Design a protein around this ligand. Sequence first.
Ligand code: HEM
Ligand code: HEM
Ligand code: HEM
Ligand code: HEM
Lengths: 140, 140, 146, 146
Amino acid sequence: VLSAADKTNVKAAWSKVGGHAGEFGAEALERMFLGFPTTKTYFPHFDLSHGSAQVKAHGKKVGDALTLAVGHLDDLPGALSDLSNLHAHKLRVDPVNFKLLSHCLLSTLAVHLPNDFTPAVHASLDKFLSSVSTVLTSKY
Amino acid sequence: VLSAADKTNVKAAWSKVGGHAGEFGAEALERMFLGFPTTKTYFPHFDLSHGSAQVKAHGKKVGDALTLAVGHLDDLPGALSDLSNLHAHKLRVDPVNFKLLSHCLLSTLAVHLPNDFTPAVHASLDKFLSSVSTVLTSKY
Amino acid sequence: VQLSGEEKAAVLALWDKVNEEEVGGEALGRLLVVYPWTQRFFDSFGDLSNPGAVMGNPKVKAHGKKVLHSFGEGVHHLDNLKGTFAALSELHCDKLHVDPENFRLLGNVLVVVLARHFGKDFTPELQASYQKVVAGVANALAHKYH
Amino acid sequence: VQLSGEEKAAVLALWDKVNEEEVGGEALGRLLVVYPWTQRFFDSFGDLSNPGAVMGNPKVKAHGKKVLHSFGEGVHHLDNLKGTFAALSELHCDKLHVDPENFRLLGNVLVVVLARHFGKDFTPELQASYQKVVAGVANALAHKYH
Ligand code: HEM
Ligand code: HEM
Ligand code: HEM
Ligand code: HEM
């Protein structure tokens, strides 16, 4: 679970991401596709080349969903209900892959916000991404 | 999360365990110590030989806590709050070890209740033990 | 990998009693029911929606038999698991894209199934040996990913 | 294990710029903060209760330097990771009882730290090579458990 202190950290850190959430989401996906090539299997319909428009558009949707989650930390199951259905029932994403994207998102935040990516902030964001991952795999 | 159908299955299956919960808990621990020798590190103070009284007593406490949980499926965080503190703050149990004990408990139930350990029941018990494990590691 | 002579003999003696079709069919079926994301790899098998459909599906039984037969080859070649599974490791990585975590999941399901079939004969000591076997197989299948 | 010549050169070129003390100290400190159960192995280091205590602890910095130095030995011997880490694999299994999942956790923390230190120079392609290195090291440290 997220403590009050973790919630404060997550909201603070995401305020520093601000308008870059979609660009970070896109870079995190690129890092994941290159680092962990088994994840490419879920995107047969995408052009996965560097700076692909479909990767940029998908990164935007991922970034916006994380922004939504940061607004709904007291009710993630409610806010992300429709995404839980999509990832479990339709897409059947292996739960391992959420760990991989989480790692790639932390890596991307480290690149762009090195002064703000403190140990305490890293810890809170890790818990946040785990809580999001738990919700998105909850309907198995 | 546990659906209504999973809750029904778990309560039904545990009614068949009945008075054997403590003996199953003890055997699951023995299976875990032999199968996964890194888990022995947490019990320096125990005699871990076959039919050790301390293993039998600890198996009883584990079995009783699972029985408690089966009674409180709508509020596991509340019922197991004190155990969450013990496993996270004092004992610092690596989360990996809950998976190992869960497996050993399923193995033990398979041994003793082969006709009752159906695929649907296996699925519900796995989710139950995961939910218990999540609560016991929640205070990290 | 690391078994005593006496452990090795107990492992092989149990394998003599394994019906590869019944155990295989059950192991694969239980994987698909318990870990439902694994169903993504078997869309060609048809209806895997509910437990009844999975356990009675003839393609599930036949595939489970194949898998278990291959496991059996490993049980008879414990000194050369990497050699026995090299071709299958390539298939699983390059052609099927199975995350290796799923090999460990199937290995553990198989142990649960052996427990169910053998009861009190599947002692804590015998389980411990089987855990070394299933981890040995899982590692050999993972070999050509990293 | 499986790197091209050009990937290998990029990995080694970055390692030339790694301060083992600053990166090591940070990597171990972050592991202890983010994954607090890992603190069980380091009770002899004293107060690891809060983030401030961990990151300033001199035993954390010194140990992190040791760990990173050893990682560096791996980076310079990518063709023989099992040989380089055999003695340490024994120590971690037989003497320390570290679950191998924790090697993968530390490897990923190290990648996050490299990202933080190198910024846009730690490209997606360079990260991908580092992921193969850290998985190679983790596997070599795990070798003498199974
Ligand atoms: C924090 C983690 C994740 C978030 C917040 C997230 C969010 C989303 C969103 C918002 C959508 C679009 C839904 C729509 O347009 O209706 C989506 C679709 C999808 N996601 Fe996820 N996702 C996550 C993780 C993953 C992972 C780990 C995978 C697989 C490796 C994945 C695979 C997909 C696929 C294949 C689609 C459909 C894309 C398309 O067809 O256009 N997702 N996700
Ligand atoms: C379903 C999982 C688990 C349950 C329900 C559970 C439950 C309990 C209970 C009820 C106690 C005794 C508390 C008391 O007397 O105050 C306890 C203690 C303890 N548990 Fe857990 N436990 C679980 C998993 C684990 C695992 C995975 C480990 C480590 C491998 C572990 C290690 C311990 C230790 C070392 C103690 C203290 C024993 C003593 O000193 O006497 N537990 N647990
Ligand atoms: C102990 C673990 C495993 C063993 C020994 C094993 C063995 C095999 C064997 C012998 C085949 C047949 C190859 C052929 O016909 O040449 C195969 C195919 C296959 N395996 Fe695995 N397997 C393992 C784990 C898994 C897991 C966990 C999954 C999925 C989650 C998987 C998915 C498949 C699929 C989709 C095929 C192709 C089926 C087809 O063509 O009809 N396997 N495996
Ligand atoms: C890439 C991964 C790792 C590498 C390269 C590594 C390397 C080392 C090295 C070089 C030593 C010193 C041995 C000596 O003085 O002879 C050591 C000791 C130690 N390592 Fe690891 N290590 C790794 C991961 C871990 C992890 C994840 C943990 C714990 C969660 C751990 C816990 C320890 C402990 C407790 C010691 C003994 C410290 C002492 O005596 O003061 N190591 N490791």
